Amino acid sequence: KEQQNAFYEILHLPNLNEEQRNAFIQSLKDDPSQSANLLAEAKKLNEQQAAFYEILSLPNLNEEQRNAFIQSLKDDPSQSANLLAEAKKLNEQQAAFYEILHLPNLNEEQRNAFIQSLKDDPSQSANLLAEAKKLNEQQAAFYEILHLPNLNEEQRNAFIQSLKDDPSQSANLLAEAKKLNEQQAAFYEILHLPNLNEEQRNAFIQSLKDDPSQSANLLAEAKKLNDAQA
């Protein structure tokens, strides 16, 4: 019975070529008593060559690392499991590494120390990248509201205080600030428009100080009137 099982299993080993497969099958033709051996040996070139494929397809390793794993596996065929996992671990460490090293809103202290905590404990890469990205978002937002040109410093340090207290609302505190910014912006450019009479200007100040939701629209209207009354 074992000749049939080993026969089928060798004929359906997915990671061998026809040369290897038919060589093994010819060996089974010579001495069927070597059945449990051949199958074993046979499949131990399977999960070897399969391994050669996977380490060949990990993109965050270099050639030296890859073919170094290939070599270290051709010398120790039975460790293909371990050497693979290790390899598939290293892929993370490097992938995280450069992703941490290419965040444009971190200074050199935060770089060298995130990266140093990566070299020290790679098992936490998944988290060290995460909070890095978070930080790279947060700090970025801090740099945007810090350079919005139409806010008095009370408004700036108010928003900054709010996001410092709660970084989970970052994208909502930024989009708020900009909003106010744009609104106030329009205000300025309405009062510095030369060809309007003070009736339309007072009415615009009132309606704007009521519904900023159409601020942009209002501004546009004003400008067009400014074009017509030149």
Numbering used by the authors: 37 to 266
Question: What does the report in the manuscript say about this coordinate set?
Answer:
Our method does not require complicated computer calculations for the design process and can be used for the assembly of artificial protein complexes with predictable and rigid structures.
We thought that proteins with alpha helices at both their N- and C-termini might be fused to generate artificial repeat proteins by connecting the C-terminal helix of the repeating unit to the N-terminal helix of the next repeating unit. In the crystal structures, all the repeating units were connected as designed. The twist and bending angles of the fused helices were very similar to those of the ideal helix. The analysis showed that the three helices also varied substantially in orientation and position in wild-type protein A structures; this result implies that crystal packing selects one specific conformation of protein A from a mixture of several available structures.
